[PDB]
Amino acid sequence: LSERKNVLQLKLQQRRTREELVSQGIMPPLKSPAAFHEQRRSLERARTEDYLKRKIRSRPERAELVRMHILEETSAEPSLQAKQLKLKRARLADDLNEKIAQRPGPMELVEKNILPV
Amino acid sequence: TTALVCDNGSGLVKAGFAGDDAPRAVFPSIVGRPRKDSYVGDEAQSILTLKYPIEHGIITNWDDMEKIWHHTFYNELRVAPEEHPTLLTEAPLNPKANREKMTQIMFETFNVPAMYVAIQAVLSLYASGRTTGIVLDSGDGVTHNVPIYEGYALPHAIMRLDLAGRDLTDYLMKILTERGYSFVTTAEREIVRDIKEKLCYVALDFENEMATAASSSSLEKSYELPDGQVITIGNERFRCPETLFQPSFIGMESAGIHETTYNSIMKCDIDIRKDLYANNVMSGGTTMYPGIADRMQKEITALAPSTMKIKIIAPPERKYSVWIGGSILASLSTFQQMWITKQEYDEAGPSIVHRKCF
Amino acid sequence: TTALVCDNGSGLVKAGFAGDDAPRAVFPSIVGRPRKDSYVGDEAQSILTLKYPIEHGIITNWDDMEKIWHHTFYNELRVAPEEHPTLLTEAPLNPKANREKMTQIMFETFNVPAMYVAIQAVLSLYASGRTTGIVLDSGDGVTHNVPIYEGYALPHAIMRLDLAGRDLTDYLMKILTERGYSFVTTAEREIVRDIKEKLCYVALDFENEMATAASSSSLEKSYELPDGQVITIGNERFRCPETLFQPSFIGMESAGIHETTYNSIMKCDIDIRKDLYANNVMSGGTTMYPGIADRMQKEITALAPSTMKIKIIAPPERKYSVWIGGSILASLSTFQQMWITKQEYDEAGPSIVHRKCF
Amino acid sequence: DETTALVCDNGSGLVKAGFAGDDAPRAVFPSIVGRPRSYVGDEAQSILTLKYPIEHGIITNWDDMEKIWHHTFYNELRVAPEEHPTLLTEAPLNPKANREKMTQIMFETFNVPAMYVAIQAVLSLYASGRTTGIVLDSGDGVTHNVPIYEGYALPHAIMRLDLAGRDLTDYLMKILTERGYSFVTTAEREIVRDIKEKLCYVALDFENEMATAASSSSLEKSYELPDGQVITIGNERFRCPETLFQPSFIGMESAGIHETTYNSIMKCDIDIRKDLYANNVMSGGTTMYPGIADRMQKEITALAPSTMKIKIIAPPERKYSVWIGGSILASLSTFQQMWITKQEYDEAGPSIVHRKCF
Amino acid sequence: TTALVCDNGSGLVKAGFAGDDAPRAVFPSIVVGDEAQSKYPIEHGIITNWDDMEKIWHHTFYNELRVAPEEHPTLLTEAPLNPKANREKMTQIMFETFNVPAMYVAIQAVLSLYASGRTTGIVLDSGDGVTHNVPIYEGYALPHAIMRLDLAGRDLTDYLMKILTERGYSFVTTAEREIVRDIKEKLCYVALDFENEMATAASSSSLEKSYELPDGQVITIGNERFRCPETLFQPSFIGMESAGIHETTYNSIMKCDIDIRKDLYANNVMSGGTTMYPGIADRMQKEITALAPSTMKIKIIAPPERKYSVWIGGSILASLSTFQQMWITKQEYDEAGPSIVHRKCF
Amino acid sequence: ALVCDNGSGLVKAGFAGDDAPRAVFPYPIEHGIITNWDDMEKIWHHTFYNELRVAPEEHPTLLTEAPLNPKANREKMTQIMFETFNVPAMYVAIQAVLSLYASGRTTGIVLDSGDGVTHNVPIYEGYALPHAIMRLDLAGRDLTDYLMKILTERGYSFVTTAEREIVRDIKEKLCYVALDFENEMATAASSSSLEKIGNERFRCPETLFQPSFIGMESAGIHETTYNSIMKCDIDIRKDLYANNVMSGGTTMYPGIADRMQKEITALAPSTMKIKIIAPPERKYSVWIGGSILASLSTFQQMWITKQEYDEAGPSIVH
Ligand SMILES: Nc1ncnc2c1ncn2[C@@H]1O[C@H](COP(=O)(O)OP(=O)(O)OP(=O)(O)O)[C@@H](O)[C@H]1O
Ligand SMILES: Nc1ncnc2c1ncn2[C@@H]1O[C@H](COP(=O)(O)OP(=O)(O)OP(=O)(O)O)[C@@H](O)[C@H]1O
Ligand SMILES: Nc1ncnc2c1ncn2[C@@H]1O[C@H](COP(=O)(O)OP(=O)(O)OP(=O)(O)O)[C@@H](O)[C@H]1O
Ligand SMILES: Nc1ncnc2c1ncn2[C@@H]1O[C@H](COP(=O)(O)OP(=O)(O)OP(=O)(O)O)[C@@H](O)[C@H]1O
Ligand SMILES: Nc1ncnc2c1ncn2[C@@H]1O[C@H](COP(=O)(O)OP(=O)(O)OP(=O)(O)O)[C@@H](O)[C@H]1O
Ligand SMILES: [Ca+2]
Ligand SMILES: [Ca+2]
Ligand SMILES: [Ca+2]
Numbered sequence A: 001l002s003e004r005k006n007v008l009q010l011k012l013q014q015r016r017t018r019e020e021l022v023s024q025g026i027m028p029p030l031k032s033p034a035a036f037h038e039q040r041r042s043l044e045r046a047r048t049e050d051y052l053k054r055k056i057r058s059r060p061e062r063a064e065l066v067r068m069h070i071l072e073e074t075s076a077e078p079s080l081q082a083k084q085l086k087l088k089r090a091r092l093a094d095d096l097n098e099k100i101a102q103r104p105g106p107m108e109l110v111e112k113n114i115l116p117v
Numbered sequence B, C: 001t002t003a004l005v006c007d008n009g010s011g012l013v014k015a016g017f018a019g020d021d022a023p024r025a026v027f028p029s030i031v032g033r034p035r036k037d038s039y040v041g042d043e044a045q046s047i048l049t050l051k052y053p054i055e056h057g058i059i060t061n062w063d064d065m066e067k068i069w070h071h072t073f074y075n076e077l078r079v080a081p082e083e084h085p086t087l088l089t090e091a092p093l094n095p096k097a098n099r100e101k102m103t104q105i106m107f108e109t110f111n112v113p114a115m116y117v118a119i120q121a122v123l124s125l126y127a128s129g130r131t132t133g134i135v136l137d138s139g140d141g142v143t144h145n146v147p148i149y150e151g152y153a154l155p156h157a158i159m160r161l162d163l164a165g166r167d168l169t170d171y172l173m174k175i176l177t178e179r180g181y182s183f184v185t186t187a188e189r190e191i192v193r194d195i196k197e198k199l200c201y202v203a204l205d206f207e208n209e210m211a212t213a214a215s216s217s218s219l220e221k222s223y224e225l226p227d228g229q230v231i232t233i234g235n236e237r238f239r240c241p242e243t244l245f246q247p248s249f250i251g252m253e254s255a256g257i258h259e260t261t262y263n264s265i266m267k268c269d270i271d272i273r274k275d276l277y278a279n280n281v282m283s284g285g286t287t288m289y290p291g292i293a294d295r296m297q298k299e300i301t302a303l304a305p306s307t308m309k310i311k312i313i314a315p316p317e318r319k320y321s322v323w324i325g326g327s328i329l330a331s332l333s334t335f336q337q338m339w340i341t342k343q344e345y346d347e348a349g350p351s352i353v354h355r356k357c358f
Numbered sequence D: 001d002e003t004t005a006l007v008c009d010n011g012s013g014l015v016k017a018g019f020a021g022d023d024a025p026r027a028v029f030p031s032i033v034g035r036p037r038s039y040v041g042d043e044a045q046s047i048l049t050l051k052y053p054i055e056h057g058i059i060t061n062w063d064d065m066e067k068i069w070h071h072t073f074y075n076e077l078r079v080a081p082e083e084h085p086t087l088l089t090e091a092p093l094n095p096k097a098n099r100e101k102m103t104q105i106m107f108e109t110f111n112v113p114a115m116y117v118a119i120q121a122v123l124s125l126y127a128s129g130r131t132t133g134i135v136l137d138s139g140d141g142v143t144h145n146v147p148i149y150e151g152y153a154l155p156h157a158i159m160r161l162d163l164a165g166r167d168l169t170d171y172l173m174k175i176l177t178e179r180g181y182s183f184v185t186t187a188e189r190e191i192v193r194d195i196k197e198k199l200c201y202v203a204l205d206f207e208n209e210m211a212t213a214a215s216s217s218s219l220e221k222s223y224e225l226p227d228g229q230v231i232t233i234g235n236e237r238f239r240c241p242e243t244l245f246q247p248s249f250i251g252m253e254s255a256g257i258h259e260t261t262y263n264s265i266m267k268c269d270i271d272i273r274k275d276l277y278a279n280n281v282m283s284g285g286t287t288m289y290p291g292i293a294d295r296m297q298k299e300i301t302a303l304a305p306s307t308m309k310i311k312i313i314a315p316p317e318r319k320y321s322v323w324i325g326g327s328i329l330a331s332l333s334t335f336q337q338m339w340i341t342k343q344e345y346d347e348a349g350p351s352i353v354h355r356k357c358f
Numbered sequence E: 001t002t003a004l005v006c007d008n009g010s011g012l013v014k015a016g017f018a019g020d021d022a023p024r025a026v027f028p029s030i031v032v033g034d035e036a037q038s039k040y041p042i043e044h045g046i047i048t049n050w051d052d053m054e055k056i057w058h059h060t061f062y063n064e065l066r067v068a069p070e071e072h073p074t075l076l077t078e079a080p081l082n083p084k085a086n087r088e089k090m091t092q093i094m095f096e097t098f099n100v101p102a103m104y105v106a107i108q109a110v111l112s113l114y115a116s117g118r119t120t121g122i123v124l125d126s127g128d129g130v131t132h133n134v135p136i137y138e139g140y141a142l143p144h145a146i147m148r149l150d151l152a153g154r155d156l157t158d159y160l161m162k163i164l165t166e167r168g169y170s171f172v173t174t175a176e177r178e179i180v181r182d183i184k185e186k187l188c189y190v191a192l193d194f195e196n197e198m199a200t201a202a203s204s205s206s207l208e209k210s211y212e213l214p215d216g217q218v219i220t221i222g223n224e225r226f227r228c229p230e231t232l233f234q235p236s237f238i239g240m241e242s243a244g245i246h247e248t249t250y251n252s253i254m255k256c257d258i259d260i261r262k263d264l265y266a267n268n269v270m271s272g273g274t275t276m277y278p279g280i281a282d283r284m285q286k287e288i289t290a291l292a293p294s295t296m297k298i299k300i301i302a303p304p305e306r307k308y309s310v311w312i313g314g315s316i317l318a319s320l321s322t323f324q325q326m327w328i329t330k331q332e333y334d335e336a337g338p339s340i341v342h343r344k345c346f
Numbered sequence F: 001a002l003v004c005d006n007g008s009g010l011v012k013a014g015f016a017g018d019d020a021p022r023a024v025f026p027y028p029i030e031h032g033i034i035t036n037w038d039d040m041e042k043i044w045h046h047t048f049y050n051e052l053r054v055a056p057e058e059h060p061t062l063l064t065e066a067p068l069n070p071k072a073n074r075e076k077m078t079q080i081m082f083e084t085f086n087v088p089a090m091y092v093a094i095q096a097v098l099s100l101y102a103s104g105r106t107t108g109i110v111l112d113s114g115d116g117v118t119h120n121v122p123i124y125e126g127y128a129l130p131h132a133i134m135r136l137d138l139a140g141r142d143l144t145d146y147l148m149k150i151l152t153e154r155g156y157s158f159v160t161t162a163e164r165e166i167v168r169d170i171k172e173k174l175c176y177v178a179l180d181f182e183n184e185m186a187t188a189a190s191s192s193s194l195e196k197i198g199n200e201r202f203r204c205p206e207t208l209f210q211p212s213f214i215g216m217e218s219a220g221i222h223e224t225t226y227n228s229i230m231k232c233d234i235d236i237r238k239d240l241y242a243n244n245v246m247s248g249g250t251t252m253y254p255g256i257a258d259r260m261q262k263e264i265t266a267l268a269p270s271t272m273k274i275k276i277i278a279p280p281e282r283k284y285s286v287w288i289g290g291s292i293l294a295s296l297s298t299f300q301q302m303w304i305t306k307q308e309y310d311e312a313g314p315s316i317v318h
């Protein structure tokens, strides 16, 4: 029995704290009622199922997200998109580069019958 | 600083703490004064004139209710209300004015930091792990069929029946008059009530049980009185609760509980009736009779579409379903946002209690 | 400066000193008076009418429990309560109310200088030398599966069964009736219990054992009754305890002890089940039947995943696993800081138990 | 990000700020300065009395505007202004004195190494991949048609309409009154702003939509308030923004947006009209309504030469077209030469803005 | 005839029945499963080995769940950014090889999101083989904003083996890898302040912890407890040029439309085994808070059962009456072929 | 919409918007240029009807070509698409530019190495700079051939159709690029987690950096990259150094990035910002860049339509 005592004492300081344990889903939440972790869980579950059953019929169309600028417009496929957008911005900035470079002076306009002396 | 859960019934207060598997405290809901100020619960029961500040589920006496609550906090649970969020319960179809008073009292009179009020039958459903079903809640003072879909009670389909526990006790005293046993006084009624709770059950077929009682007897049972005297009881065992299926038994014109359940479901939107049939939950002391489950099962089967899914849920703890529901709910991290705080009350006043919900 | 250990059961009190190998005192957990105050334990055996202050593992009679505790201190152990830190044990899922009342009586009536309460099953697990494992405690009134992870009992997965030892004695009395052996009286029940503990065992394959009883018999055994007469007992030897695996033997509708064990383990986190399977520890007088280990190992391996390591630990002294466990704990250096002190109680009340003992 | 250019879009309602090259502004907050009833943006929203230092797209409170920029640098973007060339936006027809003042403060107060000032509308155009078109810019405080040729806004052709988003919110509040809903408080004005934003839309054919509404229902929508109440909204959904097309709805004498669009095109050189009609770009939050582009299509359709090419460009990012346009411009190799440097500023002074920003 | 649910991870298959509280079965994804315990068909979340994968599923139906596939509609999970290719093939196999009556493919992250009771937010899913930031809006993953990190649970174990090497504890073998993984799971945690926690180890020690090996002897571990998971915030620890998971979350949000950012910051949900460290929640916030616009509401949400968030999400979804019409039916598949999965699963 | 990348050794085909070419299969093309118009039309017909299984009149079709492709090839390929196959629209794009696009960039310098030709292509804002483009005929098939030659030492002989396939396979399965070839040689001869075949693993692709291994006095791929850079305007060079992307099957060797990083480091001024881009899918970077571009809305206006072709002729391609 002197020995049963030592293993124990080394194993009781090997222990994580319950906070940590419910923190790891091993413990149920202390403070919830201990009989009725089942129904408590059931209930939280339903609660969620219900939210889902609703937020689902309310599900928008891909279209609509893109209308809001949530998703990129509009093809191609999940993975391509990421880069494709980089390319969209790239191709355009460049398309703009010379456009501004070769920008008529004010004189060009005035003589082209636009704007006053 | 743990939250308090207080279920005010017509007959019994049930009180305790969030977290807890059952109400720490349970006492009669009565205020007495000499026939020194006022005696509350059992103090009054032991010269005194008695009032029930809750009738058929509803607070009808505010000053006495106030006195009930003070006893609950300070004498039964022994807590300072300022330090405790408090969840109260209410009856189905409680007028909005009550819950506002009830709130104002808690905040200005008890200076609770936060509080909540929930519907009795709803909590009972919750304690069955469901958000949808139809509750038969029957306490001491009232019975309700309360359909609930998604945590919303369906008020247009709620059935109330003034027949409940006390009425059953009183009727048992009258049918005990048949064997010529005399019960009237304070003391005497308590005995009858104990007999009810210990010996009564629900006959699966009442008329068969009657044609049989008029015959054999595994039926008859004995009971010892305090002074040592022993008594014997027969068909009174199942005739007493039969009143719930035949209210004509106490001269009530109303339909029986199976019928009111059906009618309640039928007052619901047709789409959800399947789900109601499949989730008939019972709660409250008056649902505690052995065999009630199976008798209801039978009665409901007799009334519904013949191929309908019918399930009766009668948790063994249904004696305290309401309260337990409270305890679970007040315990949830998700619920903590839903307390009405003192600050909220101050800026918004009592009307704020109606808001939020699940 | 010397701890004491008291393990309070439905049937028996186990009590002694910390660092003891075994409880100095084991006596029946009962209080009696004529059918000169009150008679506790074996005093009541010497005519009288009885109460068991603990039913199914939980304290239900505080008055009489107090007389139990007094007897333990003054008659059995013969100490001055005031001078000994005292470790108490409790049933799993003991109502928060109970731990508190127990704490309170300890400090206020018996003036213990310090105390603590742990959960029976965890003690047994410790006497097994583990902090993680699922225990099966079967005593006289109640049987539990209690998973425990790193010291902590897992409340959601706890299983309770109202079948236990007392039931089994009673059953043996009834089945000895078949061979026409007459057993009913107080004296007779004791005889039967003796036979139970001395002669009964768990058949590794029941149907086969039955069909073997029916044939040969290395199986039949003789037993000399205290009056000099000799009887012979056969399949009753294993039929009696078989009831634990088939509660239907006494018409109880619950599943058997292996089923409950399986279900209890399946109620726990999937990542720790492996660890529960392999550390299944037995305790209590009622797990004392020979070969129950073996039976259990088979049943469980049948039910679990085939790759699953199953191991039953059943230490020989599991009769007192709980007590011994307590003796070990009480004796820990690391534990001395964890007693609840008189000072701490005065300042925080009975509720301190909840923060210190878990 | 050591020397990355910054882009700051100063709208009447919202400041849009970030770093050149990003798709989206780093930060968007309200354009306000507060003192007790100084704090900036969302800081001020959370007790205070506020100013909006930008009215109808034009800076009107210079001291407070500086505090807006300081917050942008140090609280929102968190940078050293001396390390960063900074692009600003301004409204069409910003008077020359404002341009100079704005320049001076950037260089003298914040010691920016470089800066540039661009037109809200032109940047929007740029972001769409155009240097020639007519923009309709409608934010919170003001609405403009801006015809633009090769990046040059045409001052003689510009239309300003003081009706904008703010005004639409206000009017919605007003008409909600008809269902008898009061929305009055600053906080309520927010809610309505939200309602506007979520559920309003522009009818294709207003008269038809009215006559339709009375019949069908796709129309009526319900909306849940902060306080748990549900309101219901109908033709207000589309009568709100109809205002843009019929400013008489709020008593304004101006012709609608379609008409000012048409009229602005007509104040541009005849030969460039085809190009304008075919490049009608919408920008600014208020251009967000579902249906708006189609309605403009059909209204300009009915206004133009029956033979003209009609195109409405309404990008999903149009809320921030202005800022994105800024991001892309500052990021161009060609633009690098176009920055005003501190050296240039020291040698010429504030008026350098006129010859450098055009 | 209950619907079936299967989360295919790089490391583990999680499988069970719709309506169960968690998976009936979990086993390693290797060739099958626990047979190989007494090739990995999934790498970095992607099925790359179709034949072994088919064996994986086969094991699942027949050895693990013990069900006839034709009798049970089946939901699978997929990684974010899964190639259209994968979706189709995975569909074909189910209907053509396993003859399922109906099936669906849902993204792992989204199932986790639903499980938390949201349909919008930004998930951090990190299992054994890959880590992602997945912003999702009403169930729609936002593909341009999805962030991928190859460092995951497996790597962390391996790095723990390497740094325990410094203490001169030798872990090298198959079975030693397993010990170290348990040590990781049991003793590791995330430092709120790494530099400080280092400075602390070197001084005090409530820090050091002890662990008893199978052979009886005890080892003692200190800074390795927090240095292991620190890799997630400092991938240069294992020589990766990547920014840490805090950083990727920031970058991910910033790639989404500015109008939903506040909702994302406020709904940052964690899922998968590698998010299981004590302290991780709190650290993330610290770090996210330091990066973001300072008025921003940041909430990190980490449900305790997040190890299985994904599976659970699946269990639930399939359990919904709303969902029964959303299954791809055998009939429908016959009528449209495997490309039906892109019109039905999104 | 359809994307067809005609390489010398592998035809890559599929649908714009997909991850990867839906079909990859096996010469009508020599060193990236269509040389056999008979077999070219057979391979195209095969692509539509046997491989992708589409009716060509219903699909806009984007094609690829080598850098510096004779403008007449583009015209004949335009002619064949509109007249033989009756496509409603089409486009022709530069292999290397597409690869850079697939990395999301429009400025950089690309090293494209497939089965039959290798190029260095500097690209500034979408435009390949023809004056700085480098061509080397050493590529994938040729590395297979040299592995057949060095496997001669171990005394294994491979010559036939079937046998060259085994060697191509071995090349793709076990070859890698040494960071320090001489240290790698000195080490193989010593230790060996090397042997699986030994030093041939890295000697085979070493040929890219030392063309003398198959008898060329040509500059290695690092040098030609540098030479290409030095043929560009000085003010655009830092951009090219910072964006060196590799594409084509023959750049698929583990460690190739790491080696090139070392070699280019040795060529530039020592303060220069250097980045080598090596995506895991660079085998199809060209096709993927095409899938991308054809999927862009901005590009839909940029197709050559059947109508535009009918009115303007094959030369409309320029
Ligand atoms: N086992 C039992 N069998 C039958 N009746 C019982 C049993 N236990 C308690 N009761 C009765 O139930 C009644 C109390 O139930 P409960 O506490 O639900 O009522 P309450 O909440 O006070 O009243 P109400 O909800 O109607 O306001 C009492 O009349 C009591 O006699
Ligand atoms: N060798 C034995 N074989 C079978 N049963 C035994 C044996 N020894 C004791 N028992 C029985 O064990 C029971 C008492 O065990 P124990 O002391 O663990 O119960 P308890 O702790 O009093 O009850 P509980 O824990 O149920 O509250 C008695 O019924 C006794 O007859
Ligand atoms: N979805 C929407 N539907 C309608 N209106 C919107 C929507 N979103 C934003 N708005 C309106 O956009 C306005 C803000 O847009 P914006 O940022 O362009 O204004 P601003 O630049 O601050 O103002 P201004 O350009 O007028 O000086 C607000 O009135 C807002 O209500
Ligand atoms: N408590 C814990 N602490 C730290 N890591 C853990 C813990 N529990 C499990 N893990 C790790 O989580 C990983 C497995 O998680 P999971 O089942 O989410 O991965 P998966 O879905 O199979 O992989 P992936 O999603 O990367 O394809 C392993 O690396 C395991 O060690
Ligand atoms: N993993 C690998 N390692 C080395 N070489 C490979 C690998 N995979 C493929 N290759 C080689 O790449 C070549 C095919 O690649 P690719 O399809 O890019 O060429 P191509 O486009 O047909 O030719 P080109 O662009 O030269 O006209 C074959 O020689 C093949 O052996
Ligand atoms: Ca009640
Ligand atoms: Ca016991
Ligand atoms: Ca603006």
Ligand SMILES: [Ca+2]
Residues within 6 Å of the ligand: E007, E008, E009, E010, E108, E127, E272, E310
């Ligand atoms: Ca996973």
Ligand SMILES: [Ca+2]
Residues within 6 Å of the ligand: F006, F007, F008, F095, F113, F114, F115, F248, F286
């Ligand atoms: Ca090629």
